[PDB]
């Protein structure tokens, strides 16, 4: 009927994700443009509209994978998620790159037209990055072979996708699906990229009198360095220039903070607190939390530097002894968690009646 | 039906395990929480529950492998074990990561639904850790490569496994087993991790008169240091931060003492001493032990630094000559072992009926 505006899409994602406004806008704009391109299928205009792929570079536990999963719940065209690690170039035991298209076909009931207008998400793209130290004498199929194979697929080429994807025999007949209009989204938490960017952007090293001295505190944060990202920096990481060229749109994510982490406990639809609160409700017990406790939990999780996943660790440790003997007790109605409980100086206050 | 409580689960595990209350509590809560997630689709409210993978750290012979094997006896869902060393990156001769899910299907007679709610245990996970591979001179399929492949698998994703090893090429229909609700338990003995934790816990800002802190430290047991483990310490051991982030709950184990070994020799059902008694009972011969003998056995075991497995070596070595000729004669009703027998300066006492 009518294509939803980017604001509607962003608002929907906010129910499941917190922060990362730049990533939300880029994803919404891309989906909006993709829908518009699909609408004018006849393409009355002489010019042939060209697609623009998207790249996601953010730290671990920043919502990269969550954004793709949430988008599927709102999208109407086929959507698929793949892992670059298992991918291998053609002619090897590892699954071929064309297998990704086979997965998309299953979602659209093996419809060639639907697959051509489908969306595809890729994760672990940083893992396939080449090793500059490794000499070129040894062939790389996991990292280099995958990048070289995705060039034509991303830019748009006819792919002989197998019907089921299990095996690809040369004599066997395969379906032909064009990828000129298919959109691909690559994600990955590039480890060590900030170091390369800082070396190039700062260039403050030097012991001589003339050379400037920079304090460690003066160094920019990891998130800030990611903002000043250029294709030349990614090339040093191990990505061939051809691959990055196919990805003109680059988006970054910011590290979570204490205030932002506090919202993750209650604001998300499937937040950690909601899961634990519901887990206790099905046993005839009520659960409550305190704002002070969340602040301490978020502060401790930040030290772990593991992202949002760190929150699950803290909560499990505090409530470990509780669940070990929760159903054994009787005449219990509500459970209240105090700030001291997180610090380990007190136990949960049980409510009887 | 009613789900078993953690107390009942711990009692059964306490029969075959000794001095592992901390680890037993974590495992009991996980199984209890896992069963609750199975009875209800998502929740009464409608929000899904994220799983929590367990990480077991402990020295060899501490019961890490025994816990998983014993737990399988009380599990009503498919269970399977795996070897991390065999796993390798895709496109290589080594075993593929997806084969682990294949093993789970064998237990449930190739039932995709049953496997989706199954439990999986991984052993010697420390072997895949990086060995000073931070520069990444060459890709390690056995080390860092295995971790990268497990990143998305632990989180949850579709896995393409052949139903019957690709019976026919047309209409292969590779089984798609989602692992979003499949629990994973990793276990392995870490060597050197204690020193890493000791260095972090070790105080002392500097050396010399300028130092404002004396850097006083005291000796601590291996188990005590492991309790203070944090994700930052594991990263320095050669683990990817993204990988450890998938395991929110971490459980540690302690060493054994004379009292623990002494109890293990008689308290468990399938105890070492009980096994020999049954082997002698079937031949019409009774066997008895003495407290003094167990004390020497425990001291010898901890003196050789061979763990609990060393016990068998000492027992058989003491009864070798005894059973070498036991079937020859007859009219023997009871056998008695003394402390001097273990020392090698005596011989077992035989009682004739």
């Amino acid at each position: 009927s009518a294509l939803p505006t980017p604001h509607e899409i962003r608002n929907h994602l906010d129910d499941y994700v917190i922060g990362q406004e730049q990533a939300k806008k880029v994803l919404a704009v891309a989906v909006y443009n993709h829908y518009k391109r699909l609408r004018n299928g006849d393409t009355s205009n002489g010019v042939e509209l060209g697609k623009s792929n998207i790249l996601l570079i953010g730290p671990t536990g920043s919502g990269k994978t969550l954004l793709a999963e949430t988008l599927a719940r709102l999208l109407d065209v086929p959507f698929t998620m793949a892992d670059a690690t298992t991918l291998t170039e053609a002619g090897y035991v590892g699954e071929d790159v064309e297998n990704i298209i086979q997965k998309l076909l299953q979602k659209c009931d093996y419809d060639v037209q639907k697959a051509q207008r489908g969306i595809v998400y890729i994760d672990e793209i940083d893992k396939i990055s080449r090793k500059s130290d490794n000499p070129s004498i040894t062939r790389d199929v996991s990292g280099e072979g995958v990048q070289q194979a995705l060039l034509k697929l991303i830019e748009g080429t006819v792919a002989a996708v197998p019907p089921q994807g299990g095996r690809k025999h040369p004599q066997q007949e395969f379906l032909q699906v064009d990828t000129s209009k298919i959109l691909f989204i690559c994600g990955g938490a590039f480890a060590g990229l900030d170091k390369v960017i800082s070396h190039r952007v700062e260039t403050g090293s030097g012991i001589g009198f003339g050379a400037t001295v920079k304090a460690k505190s003066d160094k920019a944060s990891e998130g800030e360095l990611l903002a000043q990202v250029e294709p030349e920096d990614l090339i040093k990481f191990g990505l061939i220039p051809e691959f990055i060229g196919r990805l003109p749109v680059v988006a970054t994510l910011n590290e979570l903070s204490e205030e932002a982490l506090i919202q993750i406990l209650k604001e998300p639809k499937n937040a950690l607190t909601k899961q634990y609160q519901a887990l206790f409700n099905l046993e005839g017990v009520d659960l409550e939390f305190r704002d002070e406790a969340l602040d301490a939990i978020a502060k401790k999780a930040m030290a772990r530097k593991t992202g949002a996943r760190g929150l699950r660790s803290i909560v499990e440790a505090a409530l470990l002894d509780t669940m070990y003997d929760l159903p054994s007790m009787e005449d219990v109605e509500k459970v209240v968690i105090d700030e001291s409980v997180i610090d380990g100086q007190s136990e949960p206050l049980l409510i009887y009646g | 039906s009613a789900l078993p409580t953690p107390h009942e689960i711990r009692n059964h595990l306490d029969d075959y395990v000794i001095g592992q209350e901390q680890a037993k509590k974590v495992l009991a809560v996980a199984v209890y929480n896992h069963y609750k997630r199975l009875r209800n689709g998502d929740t009464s409210n409608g929000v899904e529950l994220g799983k929590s993978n367990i990480l077991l750290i402990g020295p060899t012979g501490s019961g890490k492998t025994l816990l998983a094997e014993t737990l399988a006896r009380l599990l009503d869902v498919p269970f399977t074990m795996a070897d991390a060393t065999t796993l390798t990156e895709a496109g290589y001769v080594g075993e593929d990561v997806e084969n682990i899910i294949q093993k789970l299907l064998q237990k449930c007679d190739y039932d995709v639904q049953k496997a989706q709610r199954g439990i999986v245990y991984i052993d010697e996970i420390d072997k895949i850790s990086r060995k000073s591979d931070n520069p990444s001179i060459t890709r390690d399929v056995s080390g860092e490569g295995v971790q990268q492949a497990l990143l998305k698998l632990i989180e949850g994703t579709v896995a393409a496994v052949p139903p019957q090893g690709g019976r026919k090429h047309p209409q292969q229909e590779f089984l798609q087993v989602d692992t979003s609700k499949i629990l994973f338990i990793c276990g392995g003995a870490f060597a050197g991790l204690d020193k890493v934790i000791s260095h972090r816990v070790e105080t002392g800002s500097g050396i010399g008169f300028g130092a404002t802190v004396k850097a006083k430290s005291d000796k601590a047991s291996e188990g005590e240091l492991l309790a203070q483990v944090e994700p930052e310490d594991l990263i320095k051991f050669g683990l990817i931060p993204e990988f450890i982030g998938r395991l929110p709950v971490v459980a540690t184990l302690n060493e054994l003492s004379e009292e623990a070994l002494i109890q293990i020799l008689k308290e468990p059902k399938n105890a070492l001493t009980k096994q020999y008694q049954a082997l002698f009972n079937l031949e019409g011969v009774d066997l008895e032990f003495r407290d003094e003998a167990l004390d020497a056995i425990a001291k010898k075991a901890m003196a050789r630094k061979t763990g609990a497995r060393g016990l068998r070596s000492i027992v058989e070595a003491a009864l070798l000559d005894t059973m070498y000729d036991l079937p020859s004669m007859e009219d023997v009703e009871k056998v008695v072992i003394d402390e001097s027998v273990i020392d090698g300066q005596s011989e077992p006492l035989l009682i004739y009926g």
Partner: peptide
């Protein structure tokens, strides 16, 4: 089918 659906194979 005792025989495989494909006789020719690919390495």
């Amino acid at each position: 089918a005792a025989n495989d659906e494909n006789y020719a194979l690919a390495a």
